[PDB]
């Protein structure tokens, strides 16, 4: 009774997380560069309901320029500056600035972070 339906839930969570990052991308672009918060960038969909905050593999730096792809409409994100050329498509903000991840930044605290 668990044979193909896992692929259904596997797609539903991806539609949820892309809804979340497309809720976030406009608030991301409406921030000044001295207020660009710290991300847990992965270029992999990382679920904001749990954040999977046990793994220190994710680097935590400051997000840079928020460009759009020209092929699709995807929100490509840069870490640091353009000079790093680090083209990532999945970020979530926290107060986990350097490597010390403690608490989650929700939507009203990235809107009021402006």
């Amino acid at each position: 009774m668990y044979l193909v339906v896992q692929a259904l839930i596997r797609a539903c969570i991806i539609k949820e997380i892309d809804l979340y990052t497309e809720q976030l991308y406009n608030i991301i672009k409406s921030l000044p560069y001295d207020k660009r918060p710290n991300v847990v960038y992965s270029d992999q969909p990382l679920d904001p309901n749990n954040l999977d905050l046990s793994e220190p593999e994710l680097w935590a730096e400051q997000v840079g320029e928020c460009m759009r792809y020209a092929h699709n409409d995807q929100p490509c994100f840069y870490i640091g500056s353009t000079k790093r050329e680090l083209r990532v498509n999945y970020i979530v903000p926290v107060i986990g600035v350097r490597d010390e991840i403690e608490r989650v930044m929700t939507l009203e605290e990235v809107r009021n972070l402006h």
């Binding site: 406009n26 409406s30 809107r111 402006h114």
Partner: protein
């Protein structure tokens, strides 16, 4: 000096500023925990109920006392108005008899049955307990005890019923002028045809079902007017007229129904009686509208039964008499003749032909006065029979078949749109949205209601006045008994549009009381202890302060001290109506305290011999003068507060002058000090609710130009305001509920680039650094405060304005004139002209150029109105889409007014506005009638206190010193030929006239027949092609031609110059000379012989003269537009000027300020301006004693002579 320099300070005015009350501190919490909010809210929800019970008792009183009235002077007035008075100095004693009648009816009201225990406090305390037996009803009236004085507004709206002022809101002017006039009219109509009505067909039932005594014939006769004054008597009058009910569904015939039953001859044309006047659906929920809709307008309803009865009745339509159908002439016959045949006014053309055969002679020239009299008589002649439509139709066409077939096909259209829409008519239909926002259901009610309402309008013509003599009968029975059932769907239509166009907000409010019937009486010194309302000023931020009930003296023991915080306080009470105030204070047990019994003054007040009824005597009036002047001189409450620097003994040659002087001096408001910490503590303890008066110019952010109302409220406490603008009492307090619920707000997000909706806004995208909401001001429980100010309570330069403008303008040498008019490509076109006729500026008003800080950003309105009409085109419900066009137009006319008030002081002018009483316009112009009438009401009431905000308040023109250059607006029919500077002028012969010649197209150049066209051609003089000008010169005489009576020169030289625009609807541009060459060589005539009138009266085919009449008419159009492109229109002249060149608009649109009008609309404004220039020329001809009676309503021939004499 200027002319507007003299026009200051003329008369009085009453404007209500209003403002928002912000609660400051914990005062809102004080209202909440002190349990103060619901009290007024429950008080303002049974106030209507106790007012309804009081009107019930007042109707009981009137029903008591009207059964004891007796107007003894009836027996003479019924003869004297039946005298055909011929005036001859006899109607003024007639008016004295009438004023005796309307006085003597009031004597039973104002004299007996208490009448002081009718409007005092005693009614709701004693009588209304007895006048009620249900416990719930007495529970309402026992609640308002102690709060009786709140009804003084309602009682002053009661005591106008019992007066004698010839106002419509009396009972006296009702039961005399609205009752006796129709009584003697219906009596004379009864006496003319009294021998028509017999016994055994209407009298034998109306002798017993209506009265069972004094049966019928005495009612119209004479002395039975003294019964019809009540509601049951006028109910019997209506049952005679409309038909009785007899408690069941037979609905038997009435007497006016017997004139609708006396039809056996078939020649009606005679009037009936008239009903009389007598004094004293949705909008709840959505499912109630659905219930009303599908339960009163299902196919199960009686209205659909009336429709099916009409279908079977019109199946039997041709089986009646073909002469017994009368249809009422009016706006209807233009569509009637267009739906039977297909032509607009050919039935009017047939009657015009017949009346041309009857009253006009065999001469070949119609009189244009006979044309106007024929128009007014065609509007006077009542109705036409269906045999008259048989005679106006040709052979092989009876007209009753088309009416039957199109009526059956239109109710078949109703059937088909019903059957396509029956999916909603299941009575268990479940909604999905709010119907204010829903669209799928509103369209269905729309398309059904429009079908049934259009058929109702389709049959509204088929009455002919209803109360008519001989006709057809058995058609008309089922006709009227289906129409009375049908017509309620239009009230349903007017109700449902009052639900789909509901407000998204809620302007429900109620009156705040704070446990005080004496709440907010007036701004005062000593009565703070009672009204409990004082205004406090701090910095530039104001406050209203209400204390409470049980701490009512908390604003007394407060001093200055200097705690670095000090609110100021306003005082210096008024003196309301000293002509009634000083007898109230000087003879009311105050005479003994200050004086004793002189007596001489007591007797001359007792006679009232200082008023009129005696002229005066210089001892008689001036004993009152010095008695007041010296009794005041010791009054310690006032005489120290007001300086009464008075004039001497001989200046007061009446009593009104001294009363006007104390009216001038009796209002001296200033500042009182009250320090901050103790009053803030008083707020903190909960003894003083402190609100802040607020609008959006009080904030520190508001650096623009303030509101005009905020300028008045700032000027109210300036040191230049002497007595000009007084802040009178009568202020109130209102709270609106928060209606946009917090689960329902929408909001633009912060720091998001929001776009700009103005196309001419050069910055293209804006960012906001915070949140902005949509209609946030409805989402908060908000208090609003109304204060009445009185502007110019004591004026000096008192004169009649209509005489004054004329005597000023006669002395003037170069008076400018601004003329406004409507149009198609432009909504309003401003011209402005000098005293000579030279145009000095003109432009359109499609764009309004808002300017600020030296930057001016133009706002188009026409493309916006085009956008909204384009939305109405694809609207699918046409009720939210057509109301907003109406409000946008009343949001557009509120910005032309600033341009007009700028231009008036700019150019010292008068304004000429297009009248709307005496013209049926083109029904295609953009700003229609119900907007232009709204515009003139908004130009008079702005000119009443004309003020420009960006001026010095102290100087003239400023808000202390507004010009008052008009009178008060009265009514939409009372706008006649003069008001202030606003001249009303009619708009005849105003668009189609060249401004360089004064030529008019005046002919009737559409084709009917060959010999008439040859009569037209032989009426010409010369038809010769000039070769070097390459045109055809048409020399003609208007004496040769019909209906050309009004002209002046009557000798014109027409031409083929330029191209024209044919309608064909398609579009067709045609160059004229080549078209005439084609029509000639198509029919083969050598057209180089100069005169060739004989050559043109030798063709014998219809296909030429049908084709030549069109070209001859299209020579004279001068109105050449496409109505698809706003840029392509021109007015061009087929006549040479005094030089010989023509006038093309194309030569003058591309000029800086053209000496002729630019477009076809500017011609309309310029020719409106020329009529006022002619009136200026008329004003100098007469003299200063007759200047008040110069007739301005200019007849056409005078205007044409002025226009043709303009270019010399």
């Amino acid at each position: 000096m200027s002319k507007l320099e003299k026009f200051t300070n003329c008369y009085s005015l009453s404007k209500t500023l209003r403002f928002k009350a912000i609660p400051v501190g914990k005062t809102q919490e004080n209202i909440d925990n002190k349990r103060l909010l619901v009290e007024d809210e429950k008080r303002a929800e049974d106030y209507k109920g106790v007012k309804k019970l009081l009107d019930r008792y007042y109707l009981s009183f009137i029903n008591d006392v009207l059964h004891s009235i007796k107007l003894k002077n009836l027996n003479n007035y019924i003869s004297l108005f039946r005298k055909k008075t011929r005036t001859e100095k006899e109607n003024k004693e007639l008016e004295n008899l009438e004023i005796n009648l309307r006085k003597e009816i009031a004597k039973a009201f104002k004299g007996n049955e208490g009448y002081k225990s009718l409007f005092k406090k005693d009614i709701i305390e004693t009588i209304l307990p007895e006048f009620l037996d249900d416990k719930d009803e007495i529970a309402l009236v026992n609640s308002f005890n102690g709060f009786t004085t709140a009804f003084t507004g309602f009682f002053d709206n009661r005591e106008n019923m019992f007066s004698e002022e010839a106002k419509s809101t009396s009972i006296a002017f009702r039961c005399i002028n609205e009752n006796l006039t129709r009584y003697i009219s219906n009596m004379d109509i009864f006496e003319k045809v009294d021998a028509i009505f017999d016994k055994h067909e209407v009298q034998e039932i109306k002798e017993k079902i209506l009265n069972s005594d004094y049966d019928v014939e005495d009612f119209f006769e004479g002395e039975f007017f003294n019964f019809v004054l009540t509601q049951e008597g006028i109910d019997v009058y209506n049952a005679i007229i409309g038909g009785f009910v007899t408690e069941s569904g037979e609905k038997i015939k009435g007497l006016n129904e017997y004139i609708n039953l006396y039809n056996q001859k078939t020649k009606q044309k005679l009037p009936k009686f008239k009903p009389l006047y007598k004094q004293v659906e949705g909008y709840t929920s959505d499912e109630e509208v659905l219930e009303v809709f599908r339960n009163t307008l299902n196919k199960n309803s009686e209205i659909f039964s009336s429709i099916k009865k009409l279908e079977k009745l019109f199946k039997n339509f041709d089986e009646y008499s073909s002469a017994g159908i009368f249809v009422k002439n009016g706006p209807a016959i233009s569509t009637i003749s267009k739906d039977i045949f297909g032509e607009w006014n050919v039935i009017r053309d047939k009657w015009n032909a017949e009346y041309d055969d009857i009253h006009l002679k065999k001469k070949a020239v119609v009189t244009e006065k006979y044309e106007d009299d024929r128009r007014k008589s065609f509007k006077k002649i009542g109705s036409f029979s269906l045999e008259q439509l048989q005679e106006y139709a040709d052979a092989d066409l009876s007209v009753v078949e088309k009416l039957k077939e199109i009526i059956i096909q239109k109710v078949d259209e109703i059937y088909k749109v019903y059957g396509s829409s029956e999916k909603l008519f299941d009575a268990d239909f479940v909604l999905e949205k709010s119907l204010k926002k829903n669209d799928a259901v509103v369209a269905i009610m729309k398309d059904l209601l429009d079908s049934v309402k259009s058929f109702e309008n389709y049959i509204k013509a088929f009455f002919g006045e209803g109360k008519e003599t001989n006709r057809d009968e058995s058609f008309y029975g089922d006709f009227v008994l289906a129409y009375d059932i049908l017509l309620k769907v239009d009230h349903i239509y007017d109700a449902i549009r009052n639900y789909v166009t509901q407000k998204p907000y809620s302007k429900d409010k109620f009156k705040l009381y704070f446990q005080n019937p004496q709440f907010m009486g007036g701004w005062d010194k000593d009565k703070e202890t009672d009204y409990r309302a004082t205004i406090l000023r701090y910095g530039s931020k104001y406050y209203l302060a209400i204390m409470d009930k049980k701490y009512a003296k908390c604003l007394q023991k407060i001093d200055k001290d200097d705690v670095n915080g000090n609110y100021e306080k306003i005082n210096y009470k008024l003196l309301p109506g000293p002509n009634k105030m000083l007898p109230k204070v000087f003879f009311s047990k105050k005479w003994m305290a200050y004086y004793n019994p002189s007596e001489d003054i007591q007797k001359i007040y007792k006679n009232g011999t200082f008023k009129k009824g005696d002229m005066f005597n210089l001892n008689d009036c001036h004993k009152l003068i010095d008695f007041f002047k010296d009794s005041i001189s010791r009054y310690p409450k006032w005489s120290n507060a007001y300086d009464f620097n008075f004039s001497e003994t001989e200046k007061y040659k009446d009593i009104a002058g001294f009363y006007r002087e104390v009216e001038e001096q009796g209002y001296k408001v200033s500042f009182e000090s009250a320090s901050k910490k103790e009053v803030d503590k008083l707020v903190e303890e909960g003894k003083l609710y402190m609100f802040q008066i607020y609008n959006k110019d009080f904030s520190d952010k508001s650096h623009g130009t303030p509101n005009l109302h905020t300028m008045y409220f700032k000027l109210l406490f300036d040191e230049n305001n002497h007595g000009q603008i007084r802040l009178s009492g009568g202020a109130e307090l209102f709270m609106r509920r928060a209606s946009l619920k917090k689960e329902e707000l929408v909001v633009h997000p912060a720091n998001s680039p929001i776009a700009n909706k103005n196309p001419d806004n050069p910055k293209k995208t804006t960012t906001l650094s915070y949140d902005v909401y949509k209609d946030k001001r409805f989402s908060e429980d908000q208090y609003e405060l109304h204060i009445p100010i009185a502007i110019n309570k004591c004026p000096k330069n008192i004169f009649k304005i209509n005489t004054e403008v004329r005597v000023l303008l006669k002395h003037d040498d170069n008076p400018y004139v601004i003329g406004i008019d409507r149009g198609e490509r432009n909504l309003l076109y401003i011209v402005v002209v000098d005293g000579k006729g030279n145009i000095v500026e003109q432009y359109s008003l499609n764009e309004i150029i808002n300017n600020f800080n030296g930057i001016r950003i133009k706002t188009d309105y026409h493309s916006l109105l085009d956008k909204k009409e384009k939305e109405r085109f694809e609207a699918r419900q046409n009720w939210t889409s057509i109301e907003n066009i109406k409000e946008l137009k009343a949001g557009y006319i509120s910005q032309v007014v600033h341009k007009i008030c700028e231009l008036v002081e700019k150019y010292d002018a008068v304004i000429a506005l297009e009248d709307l009483n005496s013209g049926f316009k083109n029904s295609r112009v953009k700003v229609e009638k119900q907007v232009y009438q709204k515009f003139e009401k908004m130009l008079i009431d702005k000119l009443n206190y004309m003020v420009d905000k960006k001026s010095n308040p102290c100087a003239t023109g400023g808000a202390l010193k507004g010009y008052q250059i008009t009178n008060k607006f009265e009514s939409f029919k009372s706008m006649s030929t003069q008001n202030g500077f606003i001249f009303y002028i009619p708009a005849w012969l105003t668009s189609k006239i060249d401004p360089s010649t004064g030529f008019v197209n005046l002919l009737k150049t559409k084709y009917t027949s060959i010999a008439d066209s040859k009569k037209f051609i032989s009426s010409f003089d010369r038809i010769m092609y000039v070769p070097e000008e390459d045109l055809f010169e048409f020399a003609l005489d208007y004496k040769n031609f019909s209906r050309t009576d009004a002209d002046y020169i009557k000798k014109w030289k027409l031409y083929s110059y330029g191209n024209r625009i044919r309608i064909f609807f398609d579009w067709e541009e045609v160059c004229l000379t080549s078209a005439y060459k084609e029509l000639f060589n198509k029919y083969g005539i050598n057209y180089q012989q100069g005169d060739i009138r004989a050559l043109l009266c030798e063709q014998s085919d219809k296909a030429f003269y049908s084709s030549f009449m069109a070209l001859m008419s299209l020579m004279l159009q001068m109105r050449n537009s496409i109505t698809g492109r706003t840029d392509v229109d021109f007015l061009i002249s087929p006549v040479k000027n005094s030089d010989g060149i023509f006038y093309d608009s194309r030569n003058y649109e591309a000029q800086e300020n053209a000496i002729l009008p630019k477009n076809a609309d500017a011609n309309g404004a310029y020719n409106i301006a020329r009529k006022v220039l002619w009136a200026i020329g008329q004003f100098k001809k007469a003299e200063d004693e007759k200047l008040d009676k110069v007739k301005i309503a200019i007849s056409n021939k005078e205007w044409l002579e002025y226009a043709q004499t303009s270019v010399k």
